Design a protein around this ligand. Structure first.
Ligand code: NI
Ligand code: NI
Ligand code: NI
Ligand code: NI
Ligand code: NI
Ligand code: NI
Lengths: 148, 105, 105, 148
């Protein structure tokens, strides 16, 4: 009893352990161009893009390849696709992202922040922008303008 | 019977943009996602739903007259990178971010 | 405005007995509890609710036409002792067991 | 602005950090008979019953005193109230419970179980009953009747 069941693209019906009809993941892996390992947006290395597509169907609907090859520590050996650029997170894992560049200019200094780099940023947006663009956390030294 | 069609309880695919919302500088990635939602009419379960559902049986005493409704019955996680309070870059796999299935409670 | 009164969205205090349900030999303690539930008409938020709620704003495009309903907005844990699969006695503090507050989604 | 706000028994209105009116826990602790520490149903020792009632209001609506004095390991020094009796859980913490005594008799042996004690129990209910009554897990040796 699956003859009649239709589960749409990406999926197929299959008889389970207790005889019942179930829909299971079955993505199209028939023309993947890159044949090697891939690094998912979850920071996990997949054996190939087919394994990533099955995980996407099964567990993480927005999981995508963020770059080709195994997931890396540091941005040294990472090539980001398109206009994306590399950052590292809290444990030094590389991620390919598109950094925001638009920050409204505040009309006072109450939003000012002092980065660990000794630089005074006009707002959180400005510090976050320099951070993404640098490639790694700078971090907040304290709120307010840096003290001279 | 989720993906919405022609009007019962069903999952509506729906994309939210963190830029639209004003969180594009706080959330590094992704830039938006298909959060989805449940729409429509209501004419596996948590423990709470399971125990209460027993007292919803026709003719049961005492009787739970539960306000039934089209809610998510299945959710999925999504990875995200964002700035924490120290403005450090953090990645997490966040549970329950995406509506995957809808049903009448 | 939870505890139900005279008929909107509100919390109904409600006791379930594990004996009524048939789980009194599996659940060692307690013997039952006020699980509670939400009843009535719908004329802090998770991340998912928050992002979707933005597109529910009057006149918004795209527009999320979300099936609004009286659901739990606050839940509480309860401790329980029960038998696991090896029939060993296990105690846990289980989250989300009790409905504490109800509201229109 | 709390003059007008009423939050029912167990609770009071109090002005918070950002000036707004809030309802906060305030249980009646004015005639507690037992003055000493108590062991909650959560397996936590409370300084007194008042501390337990505040936790009940604040975090665990069904939290109760399960016995007086600090929470104990082993059932050796525990006095259970009423008709309740003592069991220990997985890490040897004592709990006062009311053991179920009613088990339907099965009409076959397919539900049979072999306990770690070498005893054949007619069903899971029967093994659970002996367990609660013994005071500690016996555990399943294997499904079916014990092999002679
Ligand atoms: Ni908008
Ligand atoms: Ni998407
Ligand atoms: Ni679907
Ligand atoms: Ni019943
Ligand atoms: Ni109760
Ligand atoms: Ni209440």
């Amino acid at each position: 009893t699956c003859e009649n069941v239709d589960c749409g693209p990406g999926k197929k019906c299959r008889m389970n352990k207790k005889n019942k009809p179930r829909c299971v993941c079955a993505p199209d892996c028939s023309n993947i161009t890159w044949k090697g390992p891939v690094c998912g947006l979850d920071g996990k290395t997949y054996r190939n893009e087919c394994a990533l597509l099955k995980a996407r169907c099964k567990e993480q609907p927005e999981l995508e390849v963020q770059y080709q090859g195994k997931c890396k520590k540091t941005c040294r050996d990472v090539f980001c696709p398109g206009s994306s650029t590399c950052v590292v997170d809290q444990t030094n894992n590389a991620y390919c992202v598109t950094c925001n560049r638009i920050c409204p200019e505040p009309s006072s200094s109450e939003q000012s922040l002092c980065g660990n780099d000794g630089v005074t940023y006009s707002s959180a947006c400005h510090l976050r922008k320099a951070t993404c663009l640098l490639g790694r956390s700078i971090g907040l030294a304290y709120e307010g303008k840096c003290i001279k | 019977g989720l993906e919405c069609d022609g009007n019962i309880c069903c999952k509506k695919q729906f994309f939210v943009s963190f830029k639209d919302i004003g969180w594009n500088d706080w959330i590094i990635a992704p830039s938006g996602y298909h959060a989805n939602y449940c729409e429509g009419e209501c004419p596996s379960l948590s423990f709470h739903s399971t125990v209460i559902n027993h007292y919803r049986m026709r003719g049961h005493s005492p009787f739970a007259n539960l306000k039934s409704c089209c809610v998510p019955t299945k959710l999925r996680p999504m990875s995200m990178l964002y700035y924490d309070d120290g403005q450090n870059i953090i990645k997490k796999d966040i549970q329950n971010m995406i509506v995957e299935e809808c049903g009448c409670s």
